[PDB]
């Protein structure tokens, strides 16, 4: 999404907590085409709306986007731990009460990296450090497990080829990107994708498995954007 | 988003089959903020990857965007029949194979909108015509229904208060909408939304119900799109 | 079982209001192999454990084990309905809090004869009139359905070649039962047989359906047995 | 069940190699009622059904019946090991494709003593040697679990209390056993009672647990039937 909004984040990736002025903002966000007009009324829009902060010196994140912006980054790289073996699993023991309850299960599973192995069988190596979110999550038997096949299982739980292909598919897709407005948009791409990283650990992980490239392209992305500010700024 | 590809594609709604000259799209593509540049390397682009097609007199449609552009608006407006009580029913009687293949089966049922009533379970009243996709959905038992308390199903089956607020809040969105580019963005939001739309016949529908406003202002967002481009053309 | 409570009861069988004597009792329940001893200690067991009345005239059925008896003749012919195509579903849509409770479940869709679709799907046509057991049995969704292969759906409800198959193994059991006491036993299979009974509607049952093969039999057994006590007792 | 069948068979248990004459069963038989007629009558057809086999000494049971009898004892006193707090998972991946399948699937998870946690994964204690019963079972994934409270587990999977409750009534029962058929009909009880025993580790097992006093009741009324058959035999 090239969208003034979600533009000037990028623009502002670890800027924060030196403040980037109207005129900088007018220079970084003109490439990616959006002149005066369309950005102050973003800027304004955003500082209403509790995104940025506005002082004399100009414009940086707020501290809930802040917030926001650092538990993102400790979802693409969350602490790991060398593994042996072991498997947490999360057993539904109860059907939830409507709709939005049972999708938001889904979407709860799916968010901590759980592959489903069947109807209400959820599984993953414990080499991430589970924890229960509260009550929500309180209906489903935590048990420890292992499987002789473990790496088989991950291929079972997960559509590891698949991702795998996508993942290619966007290392390409940067290579060919030709302007700053073309590489934004894979990144935005290669976050979504991140985002749904099993973060398989090492002995499971197959040898053309894309994660380490598509972290790589990505950090070169943010490097290029900060890089830029400076330039200005300075 | 507001990328080059998706606006020359909103930009071109409902030309088919007349031409657009380069010019042309120069001068609508503009106030979405991309000069020549971004523009012709993406018309380019586009061609070459069989989404436009370009002659003497400039570019339309491809016949493959066109017809996916087709499948799109009968799936915004699926011919509905007037609705006598019945449900289609569909029971998995097998599991599938693999993770791509069980998570198919969920995609496919919400693309069709049948709602989980429960695990295995999938529903929806019988006002869409159900056609079972070949082989991929051979694997459930159809069956038709009754309820004694079908809006209370309907309620159990989808969120409908959470798919009402986040309607009515697109609404607002679009009401509060600045300029074309965040029209644009509105408008997108609310195709993904009716994307989900349960459909629902009349008798089931609550009164809140925002479906009927988000296609007005969906239809309304489109005639001006189409306006700009008679009034650039003649 | 040929102990001597439950052949005291078969030798009662439709007895009640009548009154059986001690004598009559031992007459009646020798050709089976059991003197005076076992028996006198029997009646005076059942008597204490609520299960036959005594009065100077001698013995009857309890009022409970006559509503008992009576409750399992309506289970053997359960008032049916010509059918219409109809079937009632239940949908479990919460899982039990305990072991005794699932279990308990399961036992009670059986009772009511109830074929299992797949896990918490039960269905079975509506020619039996279904009252829901109060609390218990609160938790599922009733719906009203229909199949347009039910005579197919049924077969894969129940085991129906193997029921039939254990019928008319049961029959040749009988023609080859010897004396009564090897005939009682065969009558107490067919009974257990019975109560297993899907009780499917005409259209739906094969024509080697060995089910009023089975009532007859079970009905030639209850005859013979009260004919020797009228020869006794007259 | 006092038939004449199972009454040999209890009277013979442990005669094996020994014969018995007719003479012997003759008299052996009786003090459960049943002079020569149904007798000679009942081991002529359990010979022709292969179930004894008959020589110039008289009777003995068959080998196929002997290793019926021996599989019974391994499945009452199944070699158990020191626990070391791991479980058996069985997970089920597969649907099985009729009705006398999934039920014999139920079967199957039933007599290898595996509780179901909830729809489709079955676990029980490490501390049986699991071999899966080749193809029939083949459709399960087979994994190896802890649980942190295991007594708690335990008392989901089976009805814990109910079991309990059952066995003391068993043997209140047989406290109260007043003759041999009594005692006969108390003891073929508590073998399909322990049939279903979950055979826990020493750990979980509840102090007013009545699997002990049940074993030694029925090893008890096994004692005093091959006593009875050297009183008359010496």
Redesign the interface.
């Known amino acids: 999404?090239?969208?003034?909004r979600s533009v000037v984040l990028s623009v502002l990736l670890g800027a924060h907590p030196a403040w980037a002025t109207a005129s900088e903002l007018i220079q970084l966000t003109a490439d990616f085409?959006?002149?005066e007009?369309?950005l102050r009324?973003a800027l304004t829009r955003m500082v209403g709306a509790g995104d940025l902060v506005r002082s004399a010196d100009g414009y940086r994140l707020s501290d809930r986007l802040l917030a926001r912006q650092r538990r993102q980054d400790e979802a693409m790289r969350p602490r790991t731990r060398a593994w042996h073996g072991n498997?947490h699993?999360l057993?539904?023991?109860?059907?939830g009460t409507?709709?939005?309850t049972?999708?938001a299960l889904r979407t709860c599973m799916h968010h901590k990296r759980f592959?489903?192995?069947?109807?209400?069988?959820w599984m993953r190596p414990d080499n991430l450090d589970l924890d229960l979110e509260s009550d929500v999550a309180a209906r489903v038997?935590?048990?420890?497990?292992?499987?002789?096949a473990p790496a088989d299982?991950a291929g079972?739980?997960?559509?590891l080829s698949?991702w795998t292909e996508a993942g290619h598919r966007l290392l390409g897709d940067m290579a060919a990107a030709?302007?700053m407005?073309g590489r934004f948009?894979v990144a935005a791409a290669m976050v979504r994708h991140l985002l749904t990283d099993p973060m398989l650990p090492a002995e499971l992980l197959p040898a053309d498995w894309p994660g380490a490239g598509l972290r790589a392209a990505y950090h070169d992305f943010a490097t290029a954007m900060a890089k830029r500010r400076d330039a200005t700024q300075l």
Do not use: C, Y
Not at 91 to 95: D, E, K, L, P, Q
Not at 116 to 121: D, I, K, N, P, S
Not at 141 to 148: V, Y
């Open positions: 999404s090239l969208t003034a085409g959006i002149k007009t369309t009324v498997w699993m057993i539904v023991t109860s059907i409507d709709a939005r049972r999708a592959g489903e192995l069947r109807e209400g069988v038997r935590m048990l420890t497990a292992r499987d002789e299982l079972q739980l997960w559509d698949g030709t302007d407005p948009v």
